[PDB]
Design a protein around this ligand. Structure first.
Ligand SMILES: CCCCCCCC/C=C\CCCCCCCC(=O)OC[C@H](O)CO
Ligand SMILES: CC(C)=CCN1CC[C@]2(C)c3cc(O)ccc3C[C@H]1[C@H]2C
Ligand SMILES: CC(C)=CCN1CC[C@]2(C)c3cc(O)ccc3C[C@H]1[C@H]2C
Ligand SMILES: CC(C)=CCN1CC[C@]2(C)c3cc(O)ccc3C[C@H]1[C@H]2C
Lengths: 220, 212, 220
């Protein structure tokens, strides 16, 4: 037998860790189990667009609790919380939250303009009421969306968003949600100082994570 | 020399007792409905003429508690995403009075400070969207809107909106929300200095009035 | 005799002092021939000729004419990129056509409109409107001015205004002064609001391209 040098063992362990971590991340990605399909949320919320946004939200929540038992928060853990980011302000009520998927009801009663953000997640907004103006990166034109339509904010893409008065939509997102949470709390920390809103957002996220962990370990 | 270390605690307890008693024995210069009616009177006038008449009547009703014309100054306010301007008439650790507004209009956060705010509208519109609600409320010239302590709303001021404002609470707590966007969005340190100087002038006026 | 003869070391030190004085005097003349590539309000007098048309054709023809007029000082079509611009609570987009330490030229605007704070930098900014509206609110007043297609907004050095842009606003912009002071404020929201570091990279790279073009033109 023979020995191996220290700097040689450095590169050897580097290669070993590289192989192990790459194959482990691949085995991780291969076992990803998305609960909601890429277009299920939109194809369901379109069936309620045009109603009273309160009635539409209630019916959508009942339908999502019926179709996916164990992945929608209870009536007690539903709470509207403000959200300030990229210069815009709205309100959200979270229904489903995990490390890859999230579902919520987003909206604003006054309207707002701002920067959508650049993060690693594909997000779908199905308009229940109001208008949605979108300005894509590198254009001089604005695209308007009305109730029924669905806006797909793609990963990497950066758009200027504008919601009109009484705008209300159903949002579903899939990707690296922790990467969204950095942009999520920027205006809360450096503008509004509304730390109770920060706590409410983090508590809703923790409640969604706990519900998903419970349904994973025991479920049904 | 241990007693020398404990004597500071003794004197500090005595000083805190004095401060507590003085905070208990504290009267307020202005009342809510006073400012409300005074502002609703001048609602139908031009906003500049209304401001002038209101400053005149406030100096009449409360001398020594309103700033002089040499220390009156319009200063911008960038906070919670919204932008406006204000002119501070009176300021203390407990109360403040100022004319506020915006000529272009704005939308943004309301703030979560330890103070009750009262905005009486001279011109324009005030849209308020309360926390946990899905509808909005509107206030037209002459009406008064109260922003409670520890409450967060969404505010929207239309074009050419101007109002009178009177707040009562722990005013130093409202200062953290006051300089957030000034440092992290506009970097307008001249306006920051102007705001701090207006607050210092109000404190100086109140001190020299209470002391002579 | 000895009357006209001069020593050598004295002459050496005298020439050193003379060169020192001459250089310290001609360093002042660095402000004597400013030679601004654009004669005061030339950009406004130019852009007022193409403002009536659609904004894209106007932009194209303006870039063509400006490359004709001052060649070598305008970026080529390979380095013309629209970049989002968030600052002072407002959002728009820019396309840089000229960049230097004393002056800059670009095309600015937004499709959705935006309101916010102008900024307190050492610069005289000239925003010449091509399409849309401009609303300016000067400091100390309670009224506002409005500017329509064909006019020019002059943002003075050290001033501070409230800026508003309506829907489909597009203008050209030319500014003199210490541009790094403007750049310090230009990317504050990008750090503390949008957190779009890719846009920060794009804007800094565009400024670097402008500086490189202006450097390799004075040396060639
Ligand atoms: C954090 C861990 C949460 C555990 C909750 C739990 O024990 O749930 C059991 C019950 O059967 C509910 O499904
Ligand atoms: C405007 C678009 C495209 C999506 C809005 N949406 C709203 C909810 C969401 C969870 C969020 C939460 C925050 O606390 C701050 C910002 C944002 C932006 C995203 C989500 C990542
Ligand atoms: C938004 C509402 C309801 C009132 C605004 N008003 C404007 C003036 C004021 C002094 C101020 C100053 C700042 O620099 C930042 C925030 C605020 C909130 C209050 C005052 C405490
Ligand atoms: C608003 C006014 C008066 C001029 C706008 N104009 C737009 C382009 C410009 C380069 C810029 C870039 C930023 O990234 C952020 C802010 C600003 C403000 C100036 C320029 C200095």
């Amino acid at each position: 037998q023979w020995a191996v040098g220290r700097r040689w063992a450095w590169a050897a362990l580097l290669l070993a860790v590289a192989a192990v971590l790459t194959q482990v991340v691949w085995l991780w990605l291969g076992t990803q189990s998305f609960v909601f399909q890429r277009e299920e949320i939109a194809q369901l919320a379109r069936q309620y667009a045009g109603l009273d946004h309160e009635l539409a939200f209630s019916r959508l929540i009942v339908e999502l609790r019926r179709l996916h038992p164990g992945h929608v928060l209870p009536d007690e853990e539903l709470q509207w919380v403000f959200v300030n980011a990229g210069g815009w302000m709205g309100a959200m009520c979270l229904l489903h939250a995990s490390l890859s998927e999230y579902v919520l009801l987003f909206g604003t009663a006054l309207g707002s303009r701002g920067h959508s953000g650049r993060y690693w997640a594909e997000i779908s907004d199905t308009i229940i009421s109001g208008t949605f103006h979108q300005w894509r990166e590198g254009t001089t034109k604005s695209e308007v969306f009305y109730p029924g339509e669905t806006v797909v904010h793609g990963p990497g893409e950066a758009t200027a968003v504008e919601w009109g008065p009484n705008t209300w939509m159903v949002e579903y997102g899939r990707g690296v949600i922790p990467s969204t949470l950095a942009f999520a709390l920027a205006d809360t920390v450096f503008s509004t100082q509304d730390f109770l809103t920060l706590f409410y957002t983090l508590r809703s996220y923790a409640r969604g994570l706990r519900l998903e962990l419970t349904t994973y370990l025991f479920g049904q």
